[PDB]
Scaffold this active site. Structure first.
Site, PDB file in Angstrom:
ATOM      1  N   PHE B  60      63.655 -60.528 102.867  1.00  0.00           N
ATOM      2  CA  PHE B  60      63.248 -61.788 102.024  1.00  0.00           C
ATOM      3  C   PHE B  60      62.239 -61.004 100.906  1.00  0.00           C
ATOM      4  CE2 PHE B  60      65.420 -65.580 103.060  1.00  0.00           C
ATOM      5  CZ  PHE B  60      65.778 -65.006 104.173  1.00  0.00           C
ATOM      6  N   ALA B  61      62.590 -60.989  99.524  1.00  0.00           N
ATOM      7  CA  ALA B  61      61.504 -60.460  98.592  1.00  0.00           C
ATOM      8  C   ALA B  61      61.431 -61.589  97.376  1.00  0.00           C
ATOM      9  CB  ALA B  61      62.200 -59.190  97.941  1.00  0.00           C
ATOM     10  N   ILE B  62      60.524 -62.320  97.652  1.00  0.00           N
ATOM     11  CA  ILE B  62      60.442 -63.653  97.102  1.00  0.00           C
ATOM     12  C   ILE B  62      58.963 -63.493  96.124  1.00  0.00           C
ATOM     13  CG2 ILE B  62      60.274 -66.303  97.112  1.00  0.00           C
ATOM     14  CD1 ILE B  62      62.183 -65.732  99.397  1.00  0.00           C
ATOM     15  N   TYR B  65      56.575 -60.180  96.222  1.00  0.00           N
ATOM     16  CA  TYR B  65      57.025 -59.468  97.301  1.00  0.00           C
ATOM     17  C   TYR B  65      58.441 -58.287  96.920  1.00  0.00           C
ATOM     18  CZ  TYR B  65      53.627 -61.257 100.685  1.00  0.00           C
ATOM     19  OH  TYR B  65      52.625 -61.634 101.611  1.00  0.00           O
ATOM     20  N   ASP B 152      57.326 -56.315 103.448  1.00  0.00           N
ATOM     21  CA  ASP B 152      56.026 -55.642 103.319  1.00  0.00           C
ATOM     22  C   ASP B 152      55.732 -54.564 104.540  1.00  0.00           C
ATOM     23  OD1 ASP B 152      55.850 -57.822 105.329  1.00  0.00           O
ATOM     24  OD2 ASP B 152      53.515 -57.565 105.086  1.00  0.00           O
ATOM     25  N   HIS B 172      54.314 -58.061 119.202  1.00  0.00           N
ATOM     26  CA  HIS B 172      53.448 -58.118 118.097  1.00  0.00           C
ATOM     27  C   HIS B 172      52.210 -57.088 118.280  1.00  0.00           C
ATOM     28  CE1 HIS B 172      50.317 -59.519 115.274  1.00  0.00           C
ATOM     29  NE2 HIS B 172      50.977 -60.419 114.861  1.00  0.00           N
ATOM     30  N   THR B 184      48.043 -66.150 120.244  1.00  0.00           N
ATOM     31  CA  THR B 184      48.066 -67.339 119.170  1.00  0.00           C
ATOM     32  C   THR B 184      49.253 -68.009 119.024  1.00  0.00           C
ATOM     33  OG1 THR B 184      48.489 -65.814 117.336  1.00  0.00           O
ATOM     34  CG2 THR B 184      46.260 -66.032 118.047  1.00  0.00           C
ATOM     35  N   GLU B 242      56.702 -67.558 112.919  1.00  0.00           N
ATOM     36  CA  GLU B 242      56.394 -66.960 114.187  1.00  0.00           C
ATOM     37  C   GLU B 242      55.776 -67.632 115.530  1.00  0.00           C
ATOM     38  OE1 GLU B 242      52.395 -64.407 114.739  1.00  0.00           O
ATOM     39  OE2 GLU B 242      54.293 -63.052 114.013  1.00  0.00           O
TER      40      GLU B 242
END
Ligand SMILES: O=c1ccn([C@@H]2O[C@H](COP(=O)(O)OP(=O)(O)O)[C@@H](O)[C@H]2O)c(=O)[nH]1
Ligand SMILES: O=c1ccn([C@@H]2O[C@H](COP(=O)(O)OP(=O)(O)O)[C@@H](O)[C@H]2O)c(=O)[nH]1
Ligand SMILES: [Mn+2]
Ligand SMILES: [Mn+2]
Lengths: 293, 293
Positions: B60-62, B65, B152, B172, B184, B242
């Site tokens: 996704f490049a919104i 980004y 990214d 992660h 988390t 996540e």
């Protein structure tokens, strides 16, 4: 098929601690090698019970090998897939010699009458044809997985759903620490089972293999067809069905490999430190006596 | 589907030598944890090329980004599934801002125009809805596996068919050595993403997951439906998609887990000894600047 696990409390996996420091626990094609310490059986049992898994166990008891059935089946009742649906398939030339063993709930036994061959080699080899054939007769409609084992054996510890996968073989206990050149593959190029000295991942035992019904039908059909080619060419592989099994698994890699915990001979090999459990073991026998009238 | 491997010459697996002595290479449910040293990529490439595997990569490049796409796609060309059929799916609100990157043979790129949400949290979370939706529009008919990643990022080393499996998550990089209580996860019972302090296997990254199209459609649909429940209840999970990914993978265990080689941030975490390769890495960015007009 789409089914969520319930909440469970168990120890956290430790990313920075190997589960075994003494053995290989994954093949180079990313198939698990099943040793004690690699699996949490509570998680696996949940996964497989939620899918309502039925496991078929095939065993051949032809001629004098009917004598091995009582111990085989009694000990399977104590140790093999307990809690899961099981269907035993006993292939025999003597239906009346099958012992009446009491089964737990959800477990059933069918006696399949087949012919006896004279030569032990042929009895052993023709299991592939007979298994492949019964894949259409029964197994596709009755079970999810098939486990195909020798009868001259007993269960001594847990053998459960940790083994289940599309296609599995088992490390032969005589060769798990050997170099590939020492493996007793068929080495004559004239046989369909031929494997050159510079090929081979493992030496798998003919006494314990399995998988999904589809993959077992593929394997057994291929091994039978290869045997028939060898027979037409006047050659019999050095270790019979095991040689052909090894050729098949070299070219069609198994999706799990069982450690020798699952196929052992304590008389011949003792109890090495690397085996934390001895699960499925040889029953002492006299080859010449038991294989001939 | 039924396809034999050719003869290959490679080193024999060593049954009595662990492939890693410093890390866990299999989960307790017998899923491989993919680290360098665990796989022979020559065997895997053969297996997957014989099945004529096509891999879809979603990104996704919104809004701002779009700036990350040129490096992302250039480096994917050098490192992602080279030799295999690849279909990139670039989801964007600005089709004209997609850079013209030269692709290798057998690799194609489709631009999928989607809406931009105002809040970065919503942009991130709505990927699940958008991926699930495109599973019917295109992916079921075009690819075998889907790999769903953050934009990214850049590829710095091999990312190949070793990752492919029905369902995978990635450790992660902030948490691979942490205890589960430090993870988390969402900790409020009012959220569908809630995980209690005594549950959890791993902390998976929202930036890199995938699987077969069927399993990815399941996952993304479930996470989107859970988000919608949370939204109707006035709660947004602490780490957005996540958090939901983590809840899903706790209850539906992945069939492979990728090590942090596959999702790393060298600026924040350096290059520890346990990482023999840094394969897919964060590109430094200023959150406030890049997420807002
Ligand atoms: O007369 C025979 C010979 C063999 N078998 C079957 O074939 C398997 C393989 O033979 P065997 O166990 O003798 O081979 P080994 O383990 O000694 O190599 C046996 O376990 C039986 O299931 C049999 O039923 N009757
Ligand atoms: O304005 C935005 C915010 C997010 N994203 C997408 O959502 C992903 C997750 O957000 P981000 O990378 O900012 O999360 P982080 O890695 O910083 O936690 C990004 O990689 C992009 O693919 C985007 O395209 N535009
Ligand atoms: Mn035997
Ligand atoms: Mn990111």
């Amino acid at each position: 098929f789409m089914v969520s696990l319930p909440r469970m409390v168990y120890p956290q996996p430790k990313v920075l601690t190997p589960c075994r420091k003494d053995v290989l626990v994954v093949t180079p094609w990313l198939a698990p090698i099943v040793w004690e310490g690699t699996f949490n059986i509570d998680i696996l049992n949940e996964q497989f019970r939620l899918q309502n898994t039925t496991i078929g166990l095939t065993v051949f008891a032809i001629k004098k090998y009917v004598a091995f059935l009582k111990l085989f089946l009694e000990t399977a009742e104590k140790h093999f897939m307990v809690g899961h649906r099981v269907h035993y398939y006993v292939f025999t030339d003597q239906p009346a010699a099958v012992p009446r063993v009491t089964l737990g709930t959800g477990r059933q036994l069918s006696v399949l009458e087949v012919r006896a061959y004279k030569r032990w080699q042929d009895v052993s080899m023709r299991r592939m044809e007979m298994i492949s054939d019964f894949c259409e007769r029964r197994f596709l409609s009755e079970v999810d997985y098939l486990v195909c084992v020798d009868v001259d054996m007993e269960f001594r510890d847990h053998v459960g759903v940790e083994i289940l996968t599309p296609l599995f073989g088992t490390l032969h206990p005589g060769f798990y620490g050997s170099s590939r050149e020492a493996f007793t593959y068929e080495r004559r190029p004239q046989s369909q089972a031929y494997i050159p000295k510079d090929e081979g991942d493992f030496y798998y035992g003919g006494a314990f293999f399995g998988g999904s019904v589809q993959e077992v039908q593929r394997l057994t059909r291929a091994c039978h067809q290869a045997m028939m080619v060898d027979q037409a060419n006047g050659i019999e592989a050095v270790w019979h069905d095991e040689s052909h099994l090894n050729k098949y698994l070299l070219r069609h890699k198994p999706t799990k490999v069982l450690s020798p915990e699952y196929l052992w001979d304590q008389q011949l090999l003792g109890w090495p430190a690397v085996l934390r459990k001895l699960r499925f073991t040889a029953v002492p026998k006299n080859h010449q006596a038991v294989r001939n009238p």
